[PDB]
Amino acid sequence: GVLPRPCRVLVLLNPRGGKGKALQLFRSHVQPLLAEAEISFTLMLTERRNHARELVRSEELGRWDALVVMSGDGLMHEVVNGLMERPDWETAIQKPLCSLPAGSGNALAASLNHYAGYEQVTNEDLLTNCTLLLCRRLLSPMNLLSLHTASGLRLFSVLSLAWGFIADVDLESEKYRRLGEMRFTLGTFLRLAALRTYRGRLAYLPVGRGPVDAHLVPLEEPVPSHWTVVPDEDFVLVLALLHSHLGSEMFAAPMGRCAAGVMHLFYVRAGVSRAMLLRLFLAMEKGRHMEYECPYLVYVPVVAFRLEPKDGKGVFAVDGELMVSEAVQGQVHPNYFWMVSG
Amino acid sequence: MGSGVLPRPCRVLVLLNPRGGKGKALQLFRSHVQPLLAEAEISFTLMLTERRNHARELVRSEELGRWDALVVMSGDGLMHEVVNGLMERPDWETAIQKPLCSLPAGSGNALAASLNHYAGYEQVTNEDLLTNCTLLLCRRLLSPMNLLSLHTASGLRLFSVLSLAWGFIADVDLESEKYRRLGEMRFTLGTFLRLAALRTYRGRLAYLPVGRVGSQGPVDAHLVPLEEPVPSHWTVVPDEDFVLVLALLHSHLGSEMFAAPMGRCAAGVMHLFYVRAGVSRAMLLRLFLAMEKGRHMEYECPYLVYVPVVAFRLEPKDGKGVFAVDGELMVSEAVQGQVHPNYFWMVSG
Amino acid sequence: GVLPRPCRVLVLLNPRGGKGKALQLFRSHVQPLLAEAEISFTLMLTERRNHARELVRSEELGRWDALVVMSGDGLMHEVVNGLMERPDWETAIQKPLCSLPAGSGNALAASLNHYAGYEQVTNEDLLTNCTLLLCRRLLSPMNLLSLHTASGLRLFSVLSLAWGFIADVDLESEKYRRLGEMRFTLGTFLRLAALRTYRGRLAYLPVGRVQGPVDAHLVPLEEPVPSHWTVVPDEDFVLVLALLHSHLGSEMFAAPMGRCAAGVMHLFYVRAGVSRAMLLRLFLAMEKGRHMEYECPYLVYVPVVAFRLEPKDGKGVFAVDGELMVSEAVQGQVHPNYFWMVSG
Amino acid sequence: MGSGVLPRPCRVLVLLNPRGGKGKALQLFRSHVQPLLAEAEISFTLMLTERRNHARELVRSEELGRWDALVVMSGDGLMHEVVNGLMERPDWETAIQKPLCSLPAGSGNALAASLNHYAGYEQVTNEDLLTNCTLLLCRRLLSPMNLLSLHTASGLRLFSVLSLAWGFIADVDLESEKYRRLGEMRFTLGTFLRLAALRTYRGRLAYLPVGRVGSQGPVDAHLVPLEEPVPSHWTVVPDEDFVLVLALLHSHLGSEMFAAPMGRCAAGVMHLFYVRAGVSRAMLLRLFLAMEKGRHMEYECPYLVYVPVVAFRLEPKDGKGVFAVDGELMVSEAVQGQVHPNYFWMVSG
Amino acid sequence: MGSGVLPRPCRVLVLLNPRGGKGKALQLFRSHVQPLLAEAEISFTLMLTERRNHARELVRSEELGRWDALVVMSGDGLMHEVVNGLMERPDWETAIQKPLCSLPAGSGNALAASLNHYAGYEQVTNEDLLTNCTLLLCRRLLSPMNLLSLHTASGLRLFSVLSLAWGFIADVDLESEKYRRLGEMRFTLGTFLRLAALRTYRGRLAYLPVGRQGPVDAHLVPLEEPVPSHWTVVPDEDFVLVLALLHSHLGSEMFAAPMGRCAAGVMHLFYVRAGVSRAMLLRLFLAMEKGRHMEYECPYLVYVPVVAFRLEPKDGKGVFAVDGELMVSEAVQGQVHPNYFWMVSG
Ligand SMILES: Nc1ncnc2c1ncn2[C@@H]1O[C@H](COP(=O)(O)OP(=O)(O)O)[C@@H](O)[C@H]1O
Ligand SMILES: Oc1ccc(Nc2nc(-c3ccc(Cl)cc3)cs2)cc1
Ligand SMILES: Oc1ccc(Nc2nc(-c3ccc(Cl)cc3)cs2)cc1
Ligand SMILES: Oc1ccc(Nc2nc(-c3ccc(Cl)cc3)cs2)cc1
Ligand SMILES: Oc1ccc(Nc2nc(-c3ccc(Cl)cc3)cs2)cc1
Ligand SMILES: Oc1ccc(Nc2nc(-c3ccc(Cl)cc3)cs2)cc1
Ligand SMILES: Oc1ccc(Nc2nc(-c3ccc(Cl)cc3)cs2)cc1
Ligand SMILES: [Cl-]
Ligand SMILES: [Cl-]
Ligand SMILES: [Mg+2]
Ligand SMILES: [Mg+2]
Structure with a gap:
């Protein structure tokens, strides 16, 4: 090694x-x-x-x-x-x-x-x-995330899959690649001041329960019975994240480095005040955003997920890169590539 | 955080x-x-x-x-x-x-x-x-x-939130329950007296280090049945003479035993320590005492080995060995375990 | 390991x-x-x-x-x-x-x-x-010896390739299989009494001059041997013996220099002209690994990575790890560290 | 024989x-x-x-x-x-x-x-x-x-019938020449005197163990150029601080120094010894003294490593190191070698 | 196929x-x-x-x-x-x-x-x-x-080619090992000893007679549900022995089922109910050598062809002999699969 x-x-x-x-x-x-x-x-x-x-x-x-x-x-x-x-x-x-x-x-x-x-x-x-x-x-x-789209495209993710608030800021943020890291801040503040919500169906395989994605069934199928179907169908954001950080100043997963073959899944359900989200966003810099009592922010460690945006196409960011689709699922593979690290 | x-x-x-x-x-x-x-x-x-x-x-x-x-x-x-x-x-x-x-x-x-x-x-x-x-x-x-999943030679499956110990630590624990009134100093006593009545323990230890992992209750996918040899990608320890084996998930082995001063364990990881036979009492005592301030590592005893692991197997080798599991006595022929990441939540700050 | x-x-x-x-x-x-x-x-x-x-x-x-x-x-x-x-x-x-x-x-x-x-x-x-x-x-x-025959057979040897005296004793010996090790002893005395020599040409590639695996040192049998090979002048022999290990049998310490290096084998040959009594001396001395301590100009030892051997009179009888094989020509190359054995 | x-x-x-x-x-x-x-x-x-x-x-x-x-x-x-x-x-x-x-x-x-x-x-x-x-x-x-083929950073290729030494052993062969009049005891006096300022030497050592080989003059097939790293199947030693490294083809380092008692080298094999930094003076001396009777291996000092090898590379950090080749002084940035099996013949019994 | x-x-x-x-x-x-x-x-x-x-x-x-x-x-x-x-x-x-x-x-x-x-x-x-x-x-x-598909209370799924035995037969198979060195004869000596010690075993027996992943056993309901309503639930709750037998012989010299070779998907079920005399049981055992044991019409020996069965030992546990191999459980049931594998025969 x-x-x-x-x-x-x-x-x-x-x-x-x-x-x-x-x-x-x-x-x-x-x-x-x-x-x-x-x-x-x-x-x-x-x-x-x-x-x-x-x-x-x-x-x-x-x-x-x-x-x-x-x-x-x-x-x-x-x-x-x-x-x-x-x-x-x-x-x-x-x-x-x-x-x-x-x-x-x-x-x-x-x-x-x-x-x-x-x-x-x-x-x-x-x-x-x-x-x-x-x-x-x-x-x-x-770890490596194996993704699958509505139109049969396989792609791999090393960092994250995002939907809703995060994908939007990433998209609209590009018109200021100029501001550097700060572009996501301006880009969040203004989406946050004019906050909205998105409609889809989240399902995942928690940890408790090309390479073959053994855990996934064709996007056409309903998920297996043993998966969790999220009750809500109204989110501010859905986020699969393989690492501790969303940016150099966004310590988004304060439980630290993932275990092998595990991803962090977050979601914010609809209903949060803008002032709470701000408070949360702000807290995320030091990774204190979970220290806040907010039934809207849900966290789960998972090996698989599926997200279907209700009513045509949702904008997705995969490792920060924009992607249009109507349905993606994915499964984490453990210890799949070598990085330099300490 | x-x-x-x-x-x-x-x-x-x-x-x-x-x-x-x-x-x-x-x-x-x-x-x-x-x-x-x-x-x-x-x-x-x-x-x-x-x-x-x-x-x-x-x-x-x-x-x-x-x-x-x-x-x-x-x-x-x-x-x-x-x-x-x-x-x-x-x-x-x-x-x-x-x-x-x-x-x-x-x-x-x-x-x-x-x-x-x-x-x-x-x-x-x-x-x-x-x-x-x-x-x-x-x-x-x-x-x-993290939570350690354990399996014994008799087919028991059990969980451990803190530690699996065998050898000197396990004996001193079991012994020491008499001097329990003396509070936490009961282990310093046991350790002092047993360090003079040293006995060693024969057995086989293998483990899976973190770096070497490829691609009822939870399944322990890293483990194979105890009557099978371990998988070839594990390390099988050459030495079969021990003073102690310790699997530990946390920084401390007691309110005054900073046993693991390297950092806090990552998710799905625990600390493994063993002490191979033939250490000098005085070096073993200096290790103990230095343990209080977490300075025992600073000594490189190349008799003391530490390795971050995701699973282990330990077979004493001369009948039903004596183990302590999170402090509790347990006897069996062979034990193996795998860590599960971030399995339960604790208050902490 | x-x-x-x-x-x-x-x-x-x-x-x-x-x-x-x-x-x-x-x-x-x-x-x-x-x-x-x-x-x-x-x-x-x-x-x-x-x-x-x-x-x-x-x-x-x-x-x-x-x-x-x-x-x-x-x-x-x-x-x-x-x-x-x-x-x-x-x-x-x-x-x-x-x-x-x-x-x-x-x-x-x-x-x-x-x-x-x-x-x-x-x-x-x-x-x-x-x-x-x-x-x-x-x-x-x-080590493993890779062989090629005139007929285009490809076979492997873990121990030895022998021609002449040794190959003949192995074949004739077969009827004394019951006598264990004494099979080769009796077999040897008998052949000594009718000592023949055998005509052929031997070439090899010494250690210094250096679908299956590729034999890069070898060229088709039909072509002559690489100019850098040694072609032994002598062309009548008593025996030729390629040997990958120290022993020729449990009481024949044939290679007293011991275990070959990786990728190397022992090549021995006895030239025509040795007397019966000297060949018998060599043979008995070989029990204790002493046969190279005798001054004998007919016994030649070289370590090699490759060899070619052609019996000029028709088909020569060989023993490969003791198994009989008949052929017009053989060549081979030893490959280093090709398989695992239990040892110490 | x-x-x-x-x-x-x-x-x-x-x-x-x-x-x-x-x-x-x-x-x-x-x-x-x-x-x-x-x-x-x-x-x-x-x-x-x-x-x-x-x-x-x-x-x-x-x-x-x-x-x-x-x-x-x-x-x-x-x-x-x-x-x-x-x-x-x-x-x-x-x-x-x-x-x-x-x-x-x-x-x-x-x-x-x-x-x-x-x-x-x-x-x-x-x-x-x-x-x-x-x-x-x-x-x-x-x-x-056996014969050792050596290459230095400067591009010189040479042969060694006995040893290559670096660190303490080489410094004593060198500092020792003055008492040449005293005979073999000069290495004792040299060792004793140089022990007082026991210094350690910074370098990188890699070797090819005997069991790990797979499938101008002679070609050194195990060796790659000094500017490329060693092949991945070699062992690179982790320690970069040594008191000595010794490549030795025979049983004796001197007429009263049975340094390699574990048995005569097979064809194409040599002994590799090194001493990691942090041994005490006294233990270094005891290992020296015990070498007279080939008993130094009996201390199982954790600082002394022995390995049978067919090739090695040693690269002093900090410009040129002083080496001894069959006892003769040689100075170089980096040296690597491999053993050639049974290359010359000697009278023996 | x-x-x-x-x-x-x-x-x-x-x-x-x-x-x-x-x-x-x-x-x-x-x-x-x-x-x-x-x-x-x-x-x-x-x-x-x-x-x-x-x-x-x-x-x-x-x-x-x-x-x-x-x-x-x-x-x-x-x-x-x-x-x-x-x-x-x-x-x-x-x-x-x-x-x-x-x-x-x-x-x-x-x-x-x-x-x-x-x-x-x-x-x-x-x-x-x-x-x-x-x-x-x-x-x-x-x-x-035919192949018999067996399920045990502990969730164990195994297969039998010949027999599942319980009570007197199973004990003699077990106790027999302590002198296997005697051969087929040892079954006779075990039999003679158990007989002087003749005991019964407590159990509940149910079957489906012929008249009415792994392979699917669709006649079987989970061991926790009661047996389907068309099965015969035997009233006896005390047996000397129960024997599912897929073939004509129990040993080389024990012609135990002379009524005819089993058709595809059928197995023999025998039982001996409580009350038989020693001398009678032994008569059955000896006459079974030339297949004459059924000619007694001894009312304690019951025979039925079946396709499926359930055995619940209720003296805590029971030792079984499964193709003569020993095994121990609180509850087993099985279903014959027809013509399921090939064997050299004439
Ligand atoms: N059951 C057998 N009956 C006869 N020959 C056999 C049998 N099994 C193997 N052989 C062959 O007999 C030959 C002699 O075997 P080998 O192991 O060389 O013994 P030896 O040391 O006596 O020559 C081999 O070529 C082997 O394949
Ligand atoms: O690439 C982007 C990163 C962060 C954001 N901004 C926001 N992140 C959040 C947020 C809160 C909690 C978690 Cl776990 C993750 C993101 C709320 S607003 C937008 C785009
Ligand atoms: O609960 C117990 C804890 C420690 C002991 N005794 C000793 N532990 C040690 C020791 C040394 C090094 C490590 Cl990493 C861990 C324990 C030395 S003596 C006995 C019972
Ligand atoms: O399997 C056999 C082995 C040896 C023999 N006989 C003889 N070998 C030799 C001989 C001499 C020198 C060497 Cl290096 C090897 C063999 C002389 S006689 C016959 C069959
Ligand atoms: O030519 C010399 C030989 C030995 C020494 N001195 C020393 N050698 C050693 C030593 C210890 C162990 C081994 Cl295996 C070899 C040398 C310790 S001190 C100096 C010059
Ligand atoms: O008071 C003194 C102490 C040491 C010395 N000199 C020397 N000591 C050594 C030496 C060698 C080995 C050991 Cl372990 C310690 C000292 C070599 S020369 C002189 C005066
Ligand atoms: O493997 C064994 C076979 C038979 C016996 N013993 C006995 N079997 C019987 C018996 C009677 C009637 C039938 Cl249909 C079958 C067996 C009576 S006594 C014990 C072990
Ligand atoms: Cl086997
Ligand atoms: Cl480059
Ligand atoms: Mg990007
Ligand atoms: Mg043979």
């Missing part, structure tokens, strides 16, 4: 999204540490969409000891799905992966920084720490 | 063992706990236990809906009975989610000690510890905790 | 090879030890040549922690070729093996007993020791 | 360093060796070899066909030169088969001490050792021996 | 218990079976079977494709292990169709004895018996056989 020393690493870096500085930051904050650690690297700049995915899908992986993704959660989403689309996905997905933050959504990197014992740092301190994790070369396994 | 709250106000069932704080749990409840509850607008009802499995049988038949939490005032022993009672129920999946609370009266209060530690408190003992744990109850914050 | 405890093992036992006592020996000398070590076994009895091979070719290998072969070297020859003939040969040949001596030729079990530190014991003493080795469950890799 | 024999009668080239044995090598030849050769019908010719690489250049250019054996009278150092001289030859593959013989003079006679041991003699020293090695040559028996 | 013959030539796996025919099974095989096989071109491989359940694990993990049939050379208890092993495989549906064959070695060869009877042979024993069944295998003809 350690990278060779010396080793070599492919760094797939997005020179633009977030700030336009990803490459200069690499140079000032990442590179000097790589050199002392004897990690030589090659930079490949990712031009546009699916570029990274297609690169990884066609890559001779045997030349690399790890792949490092320097951008946001989206890039890592691209990389892991590209490895999963290959004929040789079974061995390909075992290539070690690393996440260095530059984008606006650095949840995976913020999570790993958390697991390593660091304070909840941000930006350049976050980059440096994640870089230090890479330089110590230690790897641990990570 | 907290992952849930009790309602305010709330109602609480209190299971108390009157032969505890040796003999005066009730008076401690009355002096140290009740007035704090009253100000926190926590209603309670006191139920008195005493007899074996009583608390277990009660929790098994309880209508859990009337209570916001179960507060167990006694030792680790009583928490063990309650959790096993909830797990034995037909509706165990929902019953294990009733929040639980540990208020130290009994002899061994490692659970309460750990939670006081997690909360940022000094390492306190007796009534300072009781007051701290009650303060936690008053603040109402909940965290999920 | 170690079998599971408890474990389960298939014993392929040939019930009448050697003196024909294998099964009672297993019952007397082996079974009590396996019970104490917590090794369940199932016995399968072999009925004829190739039986063992066929059982192993079609066997469900996932039910077994090892295969124990209780016979001579020939049964192990059959078991290993059985695994190599399977489509899943690459994982199959990684099943651990163990050899318990109970035929007349027990070179492999004698070599393993030697590597484990014991004395050069015979019969039930040998059987006991090799059982003590299984009970302790330790495993180490062995 | 012998794997070949010298002819009787035979003739031998004797390469002798007149400076060794405190300058008495030639007179020791005359008193202890010559009279035995005569009775054994061994002819000889003596060639004096004292300047640097002299003996190496001799063996490189010699017509080896005129000799049955080369006998080397001096230390491990001269054996080292001769063997490297043979391997530097364009006909090295036949040259390296010339039987070699090691006759002890002076100190640093670990090779002669091992052969004397393999043959069954007591651990004798000085003239007794010389006599014994001489009686081995008269008996004419030959055995093949 | 399919036709009732073996291929010629064929190859066969032989599971032999060596500790049988008092330690002679293998020698019996060598002198009595092997030369017959060789002439019929039946290839075989022998595999020996030590411990309890060993045959069962072996058959459960076996690559069935290598074999045209599995021969069991032991007693009824080995056949029992073999079938249960086949029925425990994920692929139980195809596995249960591999033909089986039963060669007698030593005691407890009811099944073998039945087959030899159905074949038209005289009631022979030991080596004569072994030779006949071997001739059967050489002739290569097969018949379908």
